[PDB]
Amino acid sequence: MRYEDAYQYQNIFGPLVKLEADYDKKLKESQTQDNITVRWDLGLNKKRIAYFTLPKTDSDMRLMQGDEICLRYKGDLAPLWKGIGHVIKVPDNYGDEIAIELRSSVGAPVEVTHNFQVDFVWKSTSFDRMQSALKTFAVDETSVSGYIYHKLLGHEVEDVIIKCQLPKRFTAQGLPDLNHSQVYAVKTVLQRPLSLIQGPPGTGKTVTSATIVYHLARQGNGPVLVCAPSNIAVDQLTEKIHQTGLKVVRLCAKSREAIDSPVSFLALHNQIRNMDSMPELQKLQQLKDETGELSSADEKRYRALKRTAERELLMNADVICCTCVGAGDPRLAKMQFRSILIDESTQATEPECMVPVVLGAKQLILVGDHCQLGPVVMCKKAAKAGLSQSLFERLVVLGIRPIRLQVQYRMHPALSAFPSNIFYEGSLQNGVTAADRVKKGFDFQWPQPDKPMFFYVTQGQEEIASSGTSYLNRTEAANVEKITTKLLKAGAKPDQIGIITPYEGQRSYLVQYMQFSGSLHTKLYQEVEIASVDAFQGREKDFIILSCVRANEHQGIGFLNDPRRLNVALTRARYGVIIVGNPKALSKQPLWNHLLNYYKEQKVLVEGPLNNLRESLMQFS
Amino acid sequence: MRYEDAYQYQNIFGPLVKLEADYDKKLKESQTQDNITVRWDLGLNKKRIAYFTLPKTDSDMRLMQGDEICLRYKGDLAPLWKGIGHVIKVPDNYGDEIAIELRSSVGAPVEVTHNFQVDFVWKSTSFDRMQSALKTFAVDETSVSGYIYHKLLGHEVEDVIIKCQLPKRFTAQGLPDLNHSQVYAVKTVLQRPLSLIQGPPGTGKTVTSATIVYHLARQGNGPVLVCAPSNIAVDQLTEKIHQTGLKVVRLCAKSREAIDSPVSFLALHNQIRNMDSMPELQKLQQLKDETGELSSADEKRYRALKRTAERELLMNADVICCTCVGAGDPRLAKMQFRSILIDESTQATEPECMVPVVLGAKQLILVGDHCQLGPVVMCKKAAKAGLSQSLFERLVVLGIRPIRLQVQYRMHPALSAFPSNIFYEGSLQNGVTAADRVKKGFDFQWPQPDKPMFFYVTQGQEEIASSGTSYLNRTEAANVEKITTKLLKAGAKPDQIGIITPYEGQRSYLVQYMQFSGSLHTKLYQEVEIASVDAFQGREKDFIILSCVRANEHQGIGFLNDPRRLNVALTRARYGVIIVGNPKALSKQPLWNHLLNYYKEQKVLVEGPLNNLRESLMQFS
Amino acid sequence: MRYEDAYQYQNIFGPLVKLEADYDKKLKESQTQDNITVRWDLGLNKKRIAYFTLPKTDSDMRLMQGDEICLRYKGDLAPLWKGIGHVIKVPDNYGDEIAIELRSSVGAPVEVTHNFQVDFVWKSTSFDRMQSALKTFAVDETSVSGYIYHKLLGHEVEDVIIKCQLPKRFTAQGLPDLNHSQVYAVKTVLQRPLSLIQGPPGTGKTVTSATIVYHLARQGNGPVLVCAPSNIAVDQLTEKIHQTGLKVVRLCAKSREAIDSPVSFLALHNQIRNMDSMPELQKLQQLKDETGELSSADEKRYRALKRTAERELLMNADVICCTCVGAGDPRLAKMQFRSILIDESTQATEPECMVPVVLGAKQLILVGDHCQLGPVVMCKKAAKAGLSQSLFERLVVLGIRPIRLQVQYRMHPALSAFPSNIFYEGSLQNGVTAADRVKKGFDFQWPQPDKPMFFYVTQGQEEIASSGTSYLNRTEAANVEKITTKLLKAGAKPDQIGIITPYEGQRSYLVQYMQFSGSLHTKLYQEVEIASVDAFQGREKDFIILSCVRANEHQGIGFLNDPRRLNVALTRARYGVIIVGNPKALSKQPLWNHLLNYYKEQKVLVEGPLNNLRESLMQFS
């Protein structure tokens, strides 16, 4: 709500951040995996590599590259050993492998493969920086403009506008032309100190954000700061903005500097390599390559030059891109940013979002969608206390009407109908046609050839799985495998299919079942993503298959019980969506009642064999 | 022929079964493989897994899942070891891997990979049950109706009919409409105690059988029994019948309960999991999951409840599905079945077929095809003695005209012409059109674009392979690789191609040759099935390539010398068939003379480079 | 130039060959790789196999099958070990595996996988035979006709013709009809003792050569000799010629006899297996198979019979095919060949080419292309001394106008335009149409849909890589991955894509980058060939991607600085070509200036995002 001053603000959010930090530490430290089989290999960069599947857990799918794992050998055929490695490969399903690069090559027990132990190393950095942002916001009233200060504290302040900021032409150099709503967004943002943009799925929030940044960077001296709580989003922004022709720098944490990515050619730590504007540095880097190492002297000099270079590139950049937490990087403190844009601001806890904000924001743009998944908070006490409400949402409650991008370009209209109607008051418009959203070289028989989606009615008993903690449904699993197979045969590719289901029992089971009972080859099914809706947020697929799993009426979790998660689940697909489930178990929740009704009205609630589908006469509600 | 009484019957068949059992034991025990390299892994169900290729043998392709292997370590870098595992993965060609799950995790020598030894464990169960069926049929004259008793013993008994059994509508709930011949079949079966149905390839014997079972189950109290000598056929029946909406139970041997399959969600051992109708059982299963094991008490109770549940589900089922031998399961003895349907009854020795029959058959339906492969009998003395004649064939000889399903739905008409004319007196009709049997997204140049088949004339010397026991033909192999490659490039997929050849030398050679000399990637060629015609019986592929191998006139084996096997070989393909061979070596057998003549008459006997084919003027006969 | 006699010739070329031999020995022996991880396996032929990647080198891509490697274990978990194996699998990129078959199975350290060492074994055979050819040519004036003697020594000799050698019909049995220029070539060759044929890429030099050989073999008694410096070319000739219906024998070195190949069914060592014309030999081979080995006696007899057989098949063949060096095989000495055809004669040093020539050539045909890559000479002193000039080129200089095949059948006309204009004075004609060269099932948006090619303008900093010795360009790499991915998604296959780049730093980097940052699956990117232009010479791909790498003006290497290499690079593709590069760095070399100008004139010099390409206004030259 409202706060009297930044100190009260800090007094409320600090403790929340602490709860969350301690809980997160406990949880991360409780995820040790016991009996791991490891496959050793050699990277082309000469570093030793370890591949290993964690059976008995799905959680390793939440790893980002650069996260560090502690690998120990707890056997008796070799000297007890312990080493740390950084993640270079993150698994896509329950049976997929993690791949890490060790910090030092030897004496890694490369001749033993079994009885290894995997721990996830917990770092307090993110939480430390969140706290630092809160303390800064409290003690330093010049960390944001007076206007934004008042607005953040929920004070009453007359609205304010800036005239004469609009460009002759809105479309940025190198980007598509913007549609009506996108232009209106850019325009409104250029006229205001604080703006909220709502970007529903498929609407081009990235292009719009890149345009905004383009214009802000052209009418400003210092770098524009661009953030997001996830590295994926940040990389996307970085790429569009870069296509703009601006001088863009992608700042990575030092933990993530041995890692490549779609946009690492813009990474700070790569840009300072082989610079002609710093011959001495060249001379040293060269000598750290030809020879193995550098003397103490040459090393100290080397580091000094690296620091100089980093300062130079950061200070002279048009745009700096990094994660919200990344903005707390020491190399960025002692810098100020007038214009800050934060994407996916609805997926970050407020403090996390404040990390970059306290770096001198005078013109702030928050892009997001409060109709989709919000912040993920581990500590239920913390969440219930308020840490689960994004800065976006809180500002919306305080009276700021977000500007919504209206035309969607991702999915076949048939697929956008329901989400549009239920979550966006029917406002979304289709920028692609049915013909545009039909896959080339694809023979698949939809019960309604014009509507690439259906609810496969499936009634089978559920079982308790995951040693008492979860559920599986063999019947639904079988139907999911049948559908998947039919899709692959129709010309689809594993990398373009996605299976969403809330229960780890069903995911583990699906992986095993397809691996040993699938019509086609194991290798095919292994490249298919299987996860809870959380994992798919922010990404798209050609085809999405849902599995609801539950046979009897129930409380529900995941998309079964959360409208936002259902929205996400229903809006990931370009070409086709198939929901495998039991209408009798779902219809108790009003939203699923709406979904089922809509699907039957479209003659697309079905049962029977895949080869010969028929409309279900099923009774529910 | 005829038998005076069931005791004479038993006196004749018993000894046969014994010969076969002893021979089979000797053979299975003689298949030990010496120097095996093993790859260790962990299943998601925490069980230890071993992958291994058997080079030097092809026989492991006859393994069914659940069959058990004895794995020993015969090296010196670890304590000599011996463990038993069940098959979870069966190989598709000479170089493919077997995968087994060990019975106990440790202390498996997981750190050694070489000099392992593989044995196939022989169980007498099947033969024991065959014998038990014969003894039962001898001592118990209430094991079958009087009518079927007389009919089986080959006695003269006036034909008999049942009026008023026909349904208002023949088509079953959830299944396609039946064609004329299928309806006639269902109808005739509902009017008779004993019926034989002949289902030529592509004719819908599974749909027809499911319809028959549907109706029999609706006009009866107890479960209908549905069997077949192979798990694949049984699974197919189970699926259609299940699509009917009936209460179906798939009974698996206890050896096959850790194994998933296309239809395991209907498996007895899965249906008795998490039953709300038996809360106590739930409570125990839950506790065997959360905790590791159960106390002695809880375990005894647990087993008792499992038995109760199994009895309940079996007694209250509409249909019970299992293999012929599976019907000898103890859980099924003490039950009676009036209506019994046996599919692939022509592929089982009579005793094997009698196993389910002696469970009280009063209305018996035998589906099969005596124009295809019959029973496989190892002991030549036994076979020659009569064990190679199915119950189907013997009944046919005794004067029962089988009812033939007439319209085929699998293959392009061009492909059905010859088999139809030669093996089915030209009766088969085409239920699919040429346009229906043209692959989507497929550029391949057939010498006759309208007829997707040809005989590639190939004259190259043969060599002796497989250490003196077999043959190979490098020339033919090269042409087979060329064709395979051309198919893959044309858009076909490895899983949809099949290579049939009678000689193991040629199969081993083909695998090696494609692995190290194939135009494309190894991974592609590795997923291609290469086998004798036997392995393909009952299954279909998009494309079938034959290799005849023999260069000089010869005795012949496999499809070279057996009309039934040739029928099978020629009827596996949906879209295309290519026979690579030497007409001069084949034309000595009259059937191949017919085939070659027909192929030349269709302007489809060819030679020359694939890219530029031409009609062969070759002279033979 | 000119030589007074064969002794002066020998005196000049001998020393060159020696320089090259010594240099080559030093180089090969300097390529030992230190810390190799090995994967052990078993071939179906029971031989022990080792797979291993050489990170830190690309050179293993120049291995031919049969080349031998020395594998040593330099660890401490097993007895120090050393074994020799022959190459059965050659890598396609920086991270791909070599696979070798050991000479003796045990006691290979199969239980250790790390700290292995790989050496390339150097054999002097090739150079020995080159020297022997030079000595023979010097001392023996009956080693070639008087005419060819004079012509080779560069003496003035009146031209000479042979009347009445032309066939009623030029087209050979089993081959396509020849076009105008091909017929003219065949015709001119049949009328002359010495002929040079120039075959630009895509023109059917193989079909034409097979036709020539066909006719020469029909109007002659002894075998025609057919050679080429590479096994691939030789195999191609062997195949066409074989399609002719002639008795063809492919001679392989004894080192390459355990290796299969596209045309090994014609290999001498396979043809002498199971010969009915030599029953005794049969009897022995059989007995070396059934039993393990042969007694001393049976072995001596066995070898004698093998020799007899080889002599027979070689003497009675219509055509003998082997590599240039292969013609120095002892089994061929003591034979004479009147008609000799040498393909790719422009890719072999003159001595190498002379190896087969000195076997009695009276009618000699040299096929090649001096506008493409010439001989690869390691010793710069040797090369500069003259060893880099092929016999073809030297003869051309001496006044022989090569006969050029004019119509090209490989590439879309759009792709042939530039190479044709710049390297072949515009003479090349298109035998395929644009419609013929559009891939089936391929949705890819070319900036000019009618011209499947473009120059992607890319400006990013370069870095020094490969420990000081090479370069990489992260920006260009990123664009190459984007393009590759777009191609794969469009329906292309990894085996049909090729990436050419001159720098090993960029190749290693590309492999790593795609392996860990590629949009699709690792397995996909791993099957993509990445190499310098050298590796692609003689082979074709559906799509070729160039990477120029250099950001600043420079000396240049590979296709950057060699017109012939650029020709090759630009003429490998059937369907599409994309050059990723910086026009400012390239335009300094006149040829690249021409290329860039042409590309802009076709509205196909572009920049911007792939999804939304735009014409570059870039200024250069």
Swiss-Prot record, chains A, B, C:
Localization, UniProt: Cytoplasm; Cytoplasm, P-body; Nucleus; Cytoplasm, Perinuclear region
Effect of residue 205 to A: Inhibits histone mRNA degradation, ATPase activity and ATP binding. No effect on interaction with DHX34
Residues of the whole record sequence present: 295 to 925 of 1129
Tissue expression summary: Ubiquitous.
Domain of life: Eukaryota
Reaction(s) catalysed by this chain's protein: ATP + H2O = ADP + phosphate + H(+)
UniProt note: domains: The [ST]-Q motif constitutes a recognition sequence for kinases from the PI3/PI4-kinase family.
Protein name in UniProt: Regulator of nonsense transcripts 1
Source organism of this protein record: Homo sapiens
Function noted in UniProt: RNA-dependent helicase required for nonsense-mediated decay (NMD) of aberrant mRNAs containing premature stop codons and modulates the expression level of normal mRNAs. Is recruited to mRNAs upon translation termination and undergoes a cycle of phosphorylation and dephosphorylation; its phosphorylation appears to be a key step in NMD. Recruited by release factors to stalled ribosomes together with the SMG1C protein kinase complex to form the transient SURF (SMG1-UPF1-eRF1-eRF3) complex.
Homology family: Belongs to the DNA2/NAM7 helicase family.
